[PDB]
Amino acid sequence: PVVALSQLNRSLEQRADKRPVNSDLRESGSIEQDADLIMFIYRDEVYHENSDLKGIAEIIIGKQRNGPIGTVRLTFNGQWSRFDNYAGPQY
Amino acid sequence: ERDPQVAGLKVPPHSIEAEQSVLGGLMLDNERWDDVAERVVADDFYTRPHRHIFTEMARLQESGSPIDLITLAESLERQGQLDSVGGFAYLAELSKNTPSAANISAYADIVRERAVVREMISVANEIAEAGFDPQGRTSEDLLDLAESRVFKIAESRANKDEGPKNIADVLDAT
Amino acid sequence: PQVAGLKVPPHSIEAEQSVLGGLMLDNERWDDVAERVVADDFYTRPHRHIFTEMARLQESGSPIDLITLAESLERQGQLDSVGGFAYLAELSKNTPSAANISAYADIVRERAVVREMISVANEIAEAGFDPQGRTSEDLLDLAESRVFKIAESRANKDEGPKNIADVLDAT
Amino acid sequence: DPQVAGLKVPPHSIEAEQSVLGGLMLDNERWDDVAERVVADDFYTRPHRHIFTEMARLQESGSPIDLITLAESLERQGQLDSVGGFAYLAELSKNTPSAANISAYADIVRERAVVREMISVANEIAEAGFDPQGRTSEDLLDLAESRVFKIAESRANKDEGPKNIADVLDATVARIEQLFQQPHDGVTGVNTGYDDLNKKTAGLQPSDLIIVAARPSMGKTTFAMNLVENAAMLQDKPVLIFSLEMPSEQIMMRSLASLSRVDQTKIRTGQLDDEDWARISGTMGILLEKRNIYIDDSSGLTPTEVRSRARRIAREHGGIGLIMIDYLQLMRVPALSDNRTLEIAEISRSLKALAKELNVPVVALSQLNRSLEQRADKRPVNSDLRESGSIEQDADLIMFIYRDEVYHENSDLKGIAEIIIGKQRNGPIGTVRLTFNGQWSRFDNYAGPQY
Amino acid sequence: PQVAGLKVPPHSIEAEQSVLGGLMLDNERWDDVAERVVADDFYTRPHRHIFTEMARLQESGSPIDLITLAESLERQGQLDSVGGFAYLAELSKNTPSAANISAYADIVRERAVVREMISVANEIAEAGFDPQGRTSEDLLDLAESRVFKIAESRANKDEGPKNIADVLDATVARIEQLFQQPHDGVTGVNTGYDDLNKKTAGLQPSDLIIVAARPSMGKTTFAMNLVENAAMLQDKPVLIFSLEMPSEQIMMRSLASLSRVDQTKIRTGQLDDEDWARISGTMGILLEKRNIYIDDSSGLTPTEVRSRARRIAREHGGIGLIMIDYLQLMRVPALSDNRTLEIAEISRSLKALAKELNVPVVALSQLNRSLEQRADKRPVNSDLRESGSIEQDADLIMFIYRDEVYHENSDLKGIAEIIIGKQRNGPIGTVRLTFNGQWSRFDNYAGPQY
Amino acid sequence: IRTGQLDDEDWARISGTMGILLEKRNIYIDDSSGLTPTEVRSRARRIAREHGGIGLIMIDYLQLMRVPALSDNRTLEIAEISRSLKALAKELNVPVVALSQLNRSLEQRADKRPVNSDLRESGSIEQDADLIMFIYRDEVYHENSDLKGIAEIIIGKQRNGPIGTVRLTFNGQWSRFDNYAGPQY
Amino acid sequence: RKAADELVHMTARINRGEAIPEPVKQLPVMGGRPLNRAQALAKIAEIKAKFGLKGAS
Amino acid sequence: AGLPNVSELVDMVYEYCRKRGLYPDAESYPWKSNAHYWLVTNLYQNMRANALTDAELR
Ligand SMILES: Nc1ncnc2c1ncn2[C@@H]1O[C@H](COP(=O)(O)OP(=O)(O)O)[C@@H](O)[C@H]1O
Numbered sequence A: 001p002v003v004a005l006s007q008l009n010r011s012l013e014q015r016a017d018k019r020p021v022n023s024d025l026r027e028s029g030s031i032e033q034d035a036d037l038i039m040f041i042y043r044d045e046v047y048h049e050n051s052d053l054k055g056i057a058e059i060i061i062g063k064q065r066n067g068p069i070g071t072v073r074l075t076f077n078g079q080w081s082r083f084d085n086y087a088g089p090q091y
Numbered sequence B: 001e002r003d004p005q006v007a008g009l010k011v012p013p014h015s016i017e018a019e020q021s022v023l024g025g026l027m028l029d030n031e032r033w034d035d036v037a038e039r040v041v042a043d044d045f046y047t048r049p050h051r052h053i054f055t056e057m058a059r060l061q062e063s064g065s066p067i068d069l070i071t072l073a074e075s076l077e078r079q080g081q082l083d084s085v086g087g088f089a090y091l092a093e094l095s096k097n098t099p100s101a102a103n104i105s106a107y108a109d110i111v112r113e114r115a116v117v118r119e120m121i122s123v124a125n126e127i128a129e130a131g132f133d134p135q136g137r138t139s140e141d142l143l144d145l146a147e148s149r150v151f152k153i154a155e156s157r158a159n160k161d162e163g164p165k166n167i168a169d170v171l172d173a174t
Numbered sequence C: 001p002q003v004a005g006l007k008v009p010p011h012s013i014e015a016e017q018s019v020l021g022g023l024m025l026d027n028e029r030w031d032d033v034a035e036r037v038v039a040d041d042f043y044t045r046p047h048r049h050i051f052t053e054m055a056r057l058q059e060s061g062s063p064i065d066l067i068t069l070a071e072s073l074e075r076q077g078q079l080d081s082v083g084g085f086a087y088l089a090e091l092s093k094n095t096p097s098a099a100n101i102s103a104y105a106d107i108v109r110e111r112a113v114v115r116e117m118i119s120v121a122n123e124i125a126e127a128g129f130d131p132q133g134r135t136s137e138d139l140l141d142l143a144e145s146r147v148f149k150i151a152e153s154r155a156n157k158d159e160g161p162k163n164i165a166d167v168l169d170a171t
Numbered sequence D: 001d002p003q004v005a006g007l008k009v010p011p012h013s014i015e016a017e018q019s020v021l022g023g024l025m026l027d028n029e030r031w032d033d034v035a036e037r038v039v040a041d042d043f044y045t046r047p048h049r050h051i052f053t054e055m056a057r058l059q060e061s062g063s064p065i066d067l068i069t070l071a072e073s074l075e076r077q078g079q080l081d082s083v084g085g086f087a088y089l090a091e092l093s094k095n096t097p098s099a100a101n102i103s104a105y106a107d108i109v110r111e112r113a114v115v116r117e118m119i120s121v122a123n124e125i126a127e128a129g130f131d132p133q134g135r136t137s138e139d140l141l142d143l144a145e146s147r148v149f150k151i152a153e154s155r156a157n158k159d160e161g162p163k164n165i166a167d168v169l170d171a172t173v174a175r176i177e178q179l180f181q182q183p184h185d186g187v188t189g190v191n192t193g194y195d196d197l198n199k200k201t202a203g204l205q206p207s208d209l210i211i212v213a214a215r216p217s218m219g220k221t222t223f224a225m226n227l228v229e230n231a232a233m234l235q236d237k238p239v240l241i242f243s244l245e246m247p248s249e250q251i252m253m254r255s256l257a258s259l260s261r262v263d264q265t266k267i268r269t270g271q272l273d274d275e276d277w278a279r280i281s282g283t284m285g286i287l288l289e290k291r292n293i294y295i296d297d298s299s300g301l302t303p304t305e306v307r308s309r310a311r312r313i314a315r316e317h318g319g320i321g322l323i324m325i326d327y328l329q330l331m332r333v334p335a336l337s338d339n340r341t342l343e344i345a346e347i348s349r350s351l352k353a354l355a356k357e358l359n360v361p362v363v364a365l366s367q368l369n370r371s372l373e374q375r376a377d378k379r380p381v382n383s384d385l386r387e388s389g390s391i392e393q394d395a396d397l398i399m400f401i402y403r404d405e406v407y408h409e410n411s412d413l414k415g416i417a418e419i420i421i422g423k424q425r426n427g428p429i430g431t432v433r434l435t436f437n438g439q440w441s442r443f444d445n446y447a448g449p450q451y
Numbered sequence E: 001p002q003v004a005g006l007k008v009p010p011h012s013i014e015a016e017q018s019v020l021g022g023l024m025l026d027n028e029r030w031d032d033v034a035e036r037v038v039a040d041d042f043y044t045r046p047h048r049h050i051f052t053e054m055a056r057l058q059e060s061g062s063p064i065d066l067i068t069l070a071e072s073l074e075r076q077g078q079l080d081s082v083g084g085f086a087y088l089a090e091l092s093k094n095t096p097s098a099a100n101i102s103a104y105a106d107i108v109r110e111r112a113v114v115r116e117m118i119s120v121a122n123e124i125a126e127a128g129f130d131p132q133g134r135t136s137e138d139l140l141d142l143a144e145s146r147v148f149k150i151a152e153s154r155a156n157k158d159e160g161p162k163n164i165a166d167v168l169d170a171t172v173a174r175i176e177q178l179f180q181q182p183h184d185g186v187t188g189v190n191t192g193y194d195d196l197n198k199k200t201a202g203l204q205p206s207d208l209i210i211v212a213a214r215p216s217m218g219k220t221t222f223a224m225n226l227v228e229n230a231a232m233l234q235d236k237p238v239l240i241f242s243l244e245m246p247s248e249q250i251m252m253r254s255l256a257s258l259s260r261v262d263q264t265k266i267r268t269g270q271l272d273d274e275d276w277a278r279i280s281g282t283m284g285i286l287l288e289k290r291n292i293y294i295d296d297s298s299g300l301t302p303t304e305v306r307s308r309a310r311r312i313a314r315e316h317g318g319i320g321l322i323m324i325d326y327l328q329l330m331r332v333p334a335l336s337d338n339r340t341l342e343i344a345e346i347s348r349s350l351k352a353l354a355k356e357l358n359v360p361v362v363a364l365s366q367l368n369r370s371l372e373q374r375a376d377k378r379p380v381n382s383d384l385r386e387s388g389s390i391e392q393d394a395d396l397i398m399f400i401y402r403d404e405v406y407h408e409n410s411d412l413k414g415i416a417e418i419i420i421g422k423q424r425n426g427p428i429g430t431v432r433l434t435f436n437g438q439w440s441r442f443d444n445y446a447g448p449q450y
Numbered sequence F: 001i002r003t004g005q006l007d008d009e010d011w012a013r014i015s016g017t018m019g020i021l022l023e024k025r026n027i028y029i030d031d032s033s034g035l036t037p038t039e040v041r042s043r044a045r046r047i048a049r050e051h052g053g054i055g056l057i058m059i060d061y062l063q064l065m066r067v068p069a070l071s072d073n074r075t076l077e078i079a080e081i082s083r084s085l086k087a088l089a090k091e092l093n094v095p096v097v098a099l100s101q102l103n104r105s106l107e108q109r110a111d112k113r114p115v116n117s118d119l120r121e122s123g124s125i126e127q128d129a130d131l132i133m134f135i136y137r138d139e140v141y142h143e144n145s146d147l148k149g150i151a152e153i154i155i156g157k158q159r160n161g162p163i164g165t166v167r168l169t170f171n172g173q174w175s176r177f178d179n180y181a182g183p184q185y
Numbered sequence G: 001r002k003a004a005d006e007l008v009h010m011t012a013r014i015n016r017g018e019a020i021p022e023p024v025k026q027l028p029v030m031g032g033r034p035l036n037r038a039q040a041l042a043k044i045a046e047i048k049a050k051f052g053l054k055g056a057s
Numbered sequence H: 001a002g003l004p005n006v007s008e009l010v011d012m013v014y015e016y017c018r019k020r021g022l023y024p025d026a027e028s029y030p031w032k033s034n035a036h037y038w039l040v041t042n043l044y045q046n047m048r049a050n051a052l053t054d055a056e057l058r
């Protein structure tokens, strides 16, 4: 398994909802095509100070070759630079 | 060779990438064919294999058969034209290396534009060459030849916006 | 000049010299020449200048013989640019009087038409090589317009500034 | 045999030189494009340099540079053997196709020549440094500086670079003396034919950009044609017209009506009596005696085409006296079709550059925005040139045409037009009143009382 | 070099060793050596290190003898890098005390110049072999700039990074140079106006100066007045680039300005005896000075401007002022597709030229129409739209404002305001001047000052 | 200093400063124009080779740098410059501080304190930079500001630490920033 | 309109008591240099002599 | 107070906008008094600067 990290253009921030999608891999079409698994990282507290989801991060599966897609919630302890299993309600 | 770009401008304008993208999109998606059909023609393709592939796909589409990779390869194999095209290896390369999730309209327009520019350049060359070598033709004959050659470019449309019709046809329709 | 594959713009200096000499020697055939050829059909600046001056003199009511033509050119200071009284005398003398200027005028004809056609083809190719922001449809429209204009009555070149004589004739 | 290890003198291309020379032989109208991209010193072989020099000389003399003419010119001077002969000239004529991208080949030749000369100069400087041969450091530095500076040589003729104040002062004194030699009664440029306009503008100055603007039906075309007629009658240099609005036949009909003072409707409908025919015959005789008016009625012209045609006319007839364009809202710049402001700025810049280069007055007609019709006073102002701020910035003279009877049927100023100088760079501003005879398509001096 | 070229890089170890040994033995000659050779002129790292340490010790007030030098090197841990006390003692011993160190220092000076010339030639060749996306104009500009830096200035090295010692010496030299000639508060080129001199201290060298105004505000007039004042109050040549007007109209305006004769009379020729005498005097002064150059070419590119400025500086040993009118007419053919990049490249090239030739460059510019729709029409920086890089790069920005242009009722007729929108090394504010459009002139404001 | 109108105490201070600087001798200045990243890397390598390493590299400013092969597109040029600077910083193991400029649209917002999106045309700069600091002086925009002489350093992005505002005192008379001695919240 | 709004806001603030602040000002400028050309030239020469390697002429 | 009414002022403004193009400057115009000068000039400047209509002019 090879995990290559990428970055998104500022155009994604021009939408009201800033959660990434597959089409947000503009200028990297080959990356979108050749990728077998695509996971986006989202944190609501980054954009909103008064967010209710502080310490909660979303892993969004935008493209899975051999399985379903969806959102996985995790706890983000930036103090220890770590991710942990979410103990709250899952949706 | 010994040519970075000195001999690289004898090449008429073209785009292999757009052709391959269009062919791959057609192979992996048969619902957009009409959108491709209304923007490109078999003579807009620079290489003989691509023209042959597009012609065979058009024939299969008109016969109602699917134009996927397997059906197209089988149809070419039966006619014995698979070897001339470049083989099932080349067909699979076109099918795989070219993504299905793409906008084939832009590539079709790119293929259309290069063909027009190249044909215009070639027609200008033919007109000048004929002018330098009359071979007994008069000035009126040369002018008529030039006019016919120039206006034959925008012509050669299969069926798209048939255009003005004589009053006889419209009266018959009425 | 073997002319065994040579690419030279169609022209004939001998026909121009014969026409100019015949017009110098016999001013009465001027009309028979004025219906077959214009100044722009000539390939050299001196010949165009001479033909224009002769036309001006003839339509101003004056003879266009050698002496009068040279005197009229000298008064405007354009005699030196043409080539001089030496070149005018050479044109008058070398070309025999016993000539059929109609055939030569028809030769200083359509050769210019073929040259204009080659010029139009060159313009089309040059526009194709450097679009300068033009789309393919615009280039096709330009080519069609040029080749359509050139093949209609062939009054002059494809398009460009025209002397007021042609415009007055059209009016 | 020479393998890939041949890296001593790469930067040259014989094929590009042959293509350039063959294309120049086949098409003589491309010479300028070649002349701006390459010089005789950019060619690597001696025969190619000699050919280019002879072609440049022939082009300067006005002669064609085709195969036969070039060979005949070379044979007269005895230099035909040095080139390689009519055999090599015919080989160049035969081998080169008409599918030539001559500009690209010229650019390739230019780049290679510069790179090769720079490398050679670097070698000379380094070898001089390694072998002083008694020279001091200052001598070596001066030699290197001279060698490096000598590389940049352009085919541009005199007055290309900066000019010493002595030469410019001599030119100014010569201009003053020339203006004093011929009494033109306060006119230093092209005479306009109107006394008040001459007093306010001192004629149409060379190297100046002149804009004439008005709402539709005010008389822009009429005033422009009157200026053209006056310039043609009161000069000797050719006057060029770029009419993208009307065919040449209607322009000539209006010009005949103006010059012969015959009713325009009679000429249009052909209902002319004997005196009108005599007037028209006299006007045609005068025009055919002068022969200094050229009309081009092509549409959709780019600034490049305008410059090329103006240069061709000036070359053929030894100069121009006035250029007229009607109008600049029909000109096209395809590379900037998306943005109108950039397109207008490019058009104005190119027109100013052409006017300065050819040393001729260039008059360009323009239109105004609809909002002018909503203001209490409808006389044009500079801000009424919306989308054309560059026009206001670059123009040396700006005149607006206003007729009160167009907006007011009960106007007291019927038959009176106003030329409003909205901007004059080297003079005052104000209003000049003229009489408008629409019957003859003419403007005339205002004979009424003056305040 | 022996036979053909053997000692190919010009150097002499013997001269360096003799100089260092003599300096160790006789510390009183240091000054004579310090004015003939620098540390960078030495070929080997040990010699440069020794010379730098000796200079540091000498300017710290200490002897530079063998023992003290070794002790100073040991404390910094750099004795082994030099070569050791053995090598220092070898330098002290081998070179005889009775030496003429001035000749050796001069020899070391010359070899460095020749070697640096060879280095610049090698850099030019390397740049030629690998253009890396550079056009022919860029390569020629680079080569000319490098060779000009070699030759025109003191015969020193290339651009490079410089130690703080050289920069400190240059700053002290600049202060002394500004002090030696009392200009009464003017350090740069004298503008000819007292209040503008007070606010700007003249036109500073190596600075980009922008003059901006709406059309018909007097922008060209003000620029030409500055050019005339710079020419009259200085000896270095003044160069003008004019894409707007022919040189003849420029000279007529200049005659009207200098001779104080009405411009309409000069243009129409209707002059009288006193006006002719004034014009004769002005022409005599101008032909006596002969330091104004005019270039009325159209379609200028930054490369052409830089090349012609370098040629003028080569011809006359320096420039005093450069004036461009205006930058909205300049062209960069390689960037014609985007106008913003073209303007940014023009501004950067002008700043680079000003820095290179150590001359003030004054470029004229226009403003946007929306300025006329505000309640107050005096320009601001944001009125330089399409030219953000112009605001970012300019060292001085002056806007010209005449109130009588917009209002006929204005009580400020004949009064113009120069508004300093951006002064990088000083204050900002408004300077009032008198505008005589009859003579195409700006003059000092004689009215009361608040 | 610029006009030369100093007194004895000022001359003594300047002499002491020059003496300290000439005793230290660890500052190098290159005032070239139009530098490419290759030239910057080569000169930094040469300095480090000659003087046993570098402690800091400073560039002012990156908008004046040039990449000739990418002059057509500004975004690609800025991305290449930032990538080359990051590579140089990692190679020489030294901190590299590069000055930049912001777009005009910032002046149209209600609050003019810079943000990351104000680095328009330079998204790669935000992506690649380890530390991003914005300088804000309130007195520049407002003449009647209550914070005259006070400047704010806003940490728009710190990769290995917190973010926030640091207040300093700005003495433009001496062209200096100093520690803020006022009350701290 | 902005002036009317500012007047309303200022009147509301005044009617609610409050004290209008007295600007902020920004620093003095100092001065007092009894130094002439000759003495400053002597100072420059002294600096040059002390630092030696100036090489300025 | 020798001031005109609104209609007279508008007529004066219209006459000025018709006739002022034939004078060297605004002070050369045959003004009846200073108040007329100031009123007409201010109205003319405001109209030509803000594109006033007739009702806005009144
Ligand atoms: N036969 C005629 N008699 C009187 N007036 C005419 C005649 N023909 C044209 N005009 C006038 O010419 C005006 C428009 O001329 P023209 O200059 O072509 O308009 P534009 O301003 O569009 O160039 C019209 O307003 C019309 O009143």
Ligand SMILES: Nc1ncnc2c1ncn2[C@@H]1O[C@H](COP(=O)(O)OP(=O)(O)O)[C@@H](O)[C@H]1O
Residues within 6 Å of the ligand: D424, D425, D426, D427, D428, E213, E214, E215, E216, E217, E218, E219, E220, E221, E222, E263, E264, E437, E438
């Ligand atoms: N002959 C003249 N007499 C009086 N003033 C003139 C004359 N020529 C030009 N001017 C004045 O010069 C001003 C514009 O000068 P200039 O700076 O050359 O134009 P710009 O400001 O567009 O560069 C105009 O406002 C005009 O009043």
Ligand SMILES: [Mg+2]
Residues within 6 Å of the ligand: D220, D221, D245
């Ligand atoms: Mg019209």
Ligand SMILES: [Mg+2]
Residues within 6 Å of the ligand: E219, E220, E244, E325
């Ligand atoms: Mg100007």
